[PDB]
Design an enzyme around this catalytic site. Structure first.
Site, PDB file in Angstrom:
ATOM      1  N   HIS A  45       0.810  -1.215   0.000  1.00 39.35           N
ATOM      2  CA  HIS A  45       0.000   0.000   0.000  1.00 39.35           C
ATOM      3  C   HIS A  45       0.845   1.267   0.000  1.00 39.35           C
ATOM      4  CE1 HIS A  45       0.432  -0.070   4.506  1.00 39.35           C
ATOM      5  NE2 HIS A  45       0.264   1.234   4.401  1.00 39.35           N
ATOM      6  N   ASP A  93       0.094  -7.585   1.646  1.00 37.43           N
ATOM      7  CA  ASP A  93       0.580  -6.209   1.724  1.00 37.43           C
ATOM      8  C   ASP A  93       2.102  -6.220   1.806  1.00 37.43           C
ATOM      9  OD1 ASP A  93       0.718  -3.475   1.873  1.00 37.43           O
ATOM     10  OD2 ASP A  93      -0.172  -3.292   3.864  1.00 37.43           O
ATOM     11  N   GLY A 186       2.866   6.262   8.573  1.00 46.84           N
ATOM     12  CA  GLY A 186       4.247   6.652   8.366  1.00 46.84           C
ATOM     13  C   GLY A 186       5.185   5.517   8.744  1.00 46.84           C
ATOM     14  N   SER A 188       4.189   2.354   8.221  1.00 46.77           N
ATOM     15  CA  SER A 188       3.836   1.352   7.217  1.00 46.77           C
ATOM     16  C   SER A 188       5.028   0.935   6.368  1.00 46.77           C
ATOM     17  CB  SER A 188       2.737   1.892   6.291  1.00 46.77           C
ATOM     18  OG  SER A 188       1.623   2.361   7.031  1.00 46.77           O
ATOM     19  N   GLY A 189       5.093  -0.353   6.052  1.00 50.59           N
ATOM     20  CA  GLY A 189       6.186  -0.857   5.240  1.00 50.59           C
ATOM     21  C   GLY A 189       7.434  -1.103   6.061  1.00 50.59           C
TER      22      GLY A 189
END
Ligand SMILES: [Ca+2]
Length: 240
Positions: A45, A93, A186, A188-189
Site C-alpha cells: 500500500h 501487503d 508513516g 507502514s512498510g
C-alpha cells in the site's frame, strides 16, 4: 510510533525511509527494510500511488544532516500479484523495491535478517517496531527514528472477536494492543524486529492499525508476516 522512544543511531541499520517527491522537496511516507544492497522490502500500500519514490538508508533525523545518509532512487517496484488496494485485510501487503544503485553497507546500513520460512512467534514474543510514523493518532511524523516494544499476540488471540476477529489472517503478525504503544501512519512498510534465539529478525512489515486509531486497546498493530513470503521474496530477487 505512538508511545515509543528515540532509537539509538545504530540500533536498526536495516530500517530505511521511503520518501516521495513533493514539489522541490521530499517527504517521508513509509518505512522499509533493506534486504539486499539493492533491494528494499516494504508494504504494497506504500507504493500504490503514482509518485516518484526515493529510498534513504542510514537515516536517523528526517530534518537534519546526520552525516550517514545515502539517497537512492527506486528503479523497479514489484508488488505482490495478489495485493488489492481496496482490501488490506486480505493480506499480501508486501512489495520489493529494486534500487537504482546498490548502497554501501556500514554500521548504519545493514541487510535486515529475515526469519526462516514458516516461522511463527510464540504468544508474547519480544519485538520492537521502528519508524518515523505519527507519534499520536492523527498527529505528526517523528523527526528522529522511534522504537516501541510491542510483544506479539498469537493468531488464536488476535483472530478472536475481542481483538481483530477474521480481519486478521494467518499470513499476518499481530503485536501490541496495550492501548499505549503501537505503529501509526508513516510506519507502514517498516520492520517489526523480533528477538529469536538471541538474534533480532524482521518478522513483520507494518501494514495496518484500527480505523479507530493507532494505539487502540486490543487492536494490536498488524504486520504482513515475513516468514510467509520467503519464497515469494527469493523468486522476485532471482528474476529481477
Ligand atoms: Ca538526516
Amino acid at each position: 510510533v505512538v508511545g515509543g522512544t528515540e532509537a539509538q543511531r545504530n540500533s536498526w541499520p536495516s530500517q530505511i525511509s521511503l520518501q516521495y517527491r513533493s514539489g522541490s522537496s521530499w517527504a517521508h511516507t513509509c518505512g522499509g527494510t533493506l534486504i539486499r544492497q539493492n533491494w528494499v522490502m516494504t508494504a504494497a500500500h506504500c507504493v500504490d500511488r503514482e509518485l516518484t519514490f526515493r529510498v534513504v538508508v542510514g537515516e536517523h533525523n528526517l530534518n537534519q544532516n546526520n552525516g550517514t545518509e545515502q539517497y537512492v532512487g527506486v528503479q523497479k517496484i514489484v508488488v505482490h500479484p495478489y495485493w488489492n488496494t481496496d482490501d488490506v485485510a486480505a493480506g499480501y501487503d508486501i512489495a520489493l523495491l529494486r534500487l537504482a544503485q546498490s548502497v554501501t553497507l556500514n554500521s548504519y546500513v545493514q541487510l535486515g535478517v529475515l526469519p526462516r520460512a514458516g516461522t511463527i512467534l510464540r504468544n508474547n514474543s519480544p519485538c520492537y517496531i521502528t519508524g518515523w510514523g505519527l507519534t499520536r493518532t492523527n498527529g505528526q511524523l517523528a523527526q528522529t527514528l522511534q522504537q516501541a516494544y510491542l510483544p506479539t499476540v498469537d493468531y488464536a488471540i488476535c483472530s478472536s472477536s475481542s481483538y481483530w476477529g477474521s480481519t486478521v489472517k494467518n499470513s499476518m503478525v499481530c503485536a501490541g494492543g496495550d492501548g499505549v504503544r503501537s505503529g501509526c501512519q508513516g510506519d507502514s512498510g517498516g520492520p517489526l524486529h523480533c528477538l529469536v534465539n538471541g538474534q533480532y529478525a524482521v518478522h513483520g512489515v507494518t501494514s495496518f492499525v484500527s480505523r479507530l486509531g493507532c494505539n487502540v486497546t486490543r487492536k494490536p498493530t498488524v504486520f504482513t508476516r515475513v516468514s510467509a513470503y520467503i519464497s515469494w521474496i527469493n523468486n522476485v530477487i532471482a528474476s529481477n
